[PDB]
Structures are given as C-alpha cells and as structure tokens.
Amino acid sequence: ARTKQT
Amino acid sequence: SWDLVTCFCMKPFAGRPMIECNECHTWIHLSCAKIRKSNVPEVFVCQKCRDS
Ligand SMILES: [Zn+2]
Ligand SMILES: [Zn+2]
C-alpha cells in the first residue's frame, strides 16, 4: 500500500 | 500539507499515518480505516469503495 507517516 | 483534508472523516492530514485507497486513490487515516501501524495490508481498499 502507498502509505505516509507509518 | 498539514491542513490538507482528504479522508472521509473530513479532518486534515496533521502528520497522522495515512494510507491511499487502491480503488479511489484517496488518502485515509489509518485510525479511520481501522488499520494498525504494525499490520498494514499490502492492498488497501477503503470502506466507501467496499460499499459500492
Ligand atoms: Zn480520517
Ligand atoms: Zn476508496
């Protein structure tokens, strides 16, 4: 998945 | 950045963990999506997309 801030 | 609203909760990014729906390409907060930081799915489809 394209995530941010993980 | 910080104030950008995309999630269905209508609240901003605000530095929070987010995940992009693979079907509608909307950024959703992990908390809103009921996803743990330690167990992110490899493909994510958001609740709105799942409801047709
Ligand atoms: Zn949200
Ligand atoms: Zn979606």
Author numbering:
A (entry chain B): 1 to 6
B (entry chain A): 229 to 280
Wording from the paper:
To gain structural insight into this specific recognition of histone H3K4me3 by the PHD domain of PHF13, we determined the crystal structures of both the apo-PHF13 PHD domain (aa 226–280) and the PHF13 PHD-H3K4me3 peptide complex. In the complex structure of PHF13 PHD-H3K4me3, we can see that the histone H3K4me3 peptide is bound against the central double-strand anti-parallel β-sheet of the PHF13 PHD domain and completes a three-stranded β-sheet. The first four residues of the H3K4me3 peptide are embedded in an exposed binding groove on the surface of the PHF13 PHD domain. Similar to other methyl lysine binding proteins, the trimethyl lysine 4 (K4me3) is bound in an aromatic cage formed by residues F241, M246 and W255 of PHF13. In addition, the K4me3 residue also forms two main chain hydrogen bonds with M246. The first residue alanine (Ala1) of the H3K4me3 peptide is anchored in a small and secluded pocket created by I247, V268, P269, E270 and F272, and the backbone amine group of Ala1 forms a hydrogen bond with the backbone carbonyl oxygen of P269 and E270 in PHF13. The limited length between the aromatic cage and the Ala1 binding pocket and the restricted nature of the Ala1 binding pocket determines that the PHF13 PHD domain selectively recognizes only methylated histone H3K4. The Arg2 residue in the H3K4me3 peptide is bound by two backbone hydrogen bonds with E248. The surface charge representation shows that Arg2 sits in a shallow negatively charged pocket, reminiscent of the Arg2 binding in the ING2 and BPTF2 PHD domain-H3K4me3 complex structures, but in contrast to the RAG2-H3K4me3 complex structure, in which Arg2 is bound in a relatively hydrophobic pocket. Our binding results show that the binding of PHF13’s PHD domain to H3K4me3 was diminished by the simultaneous asymmetric dimethylation of Arg2 (H3R2me2aK4me3).
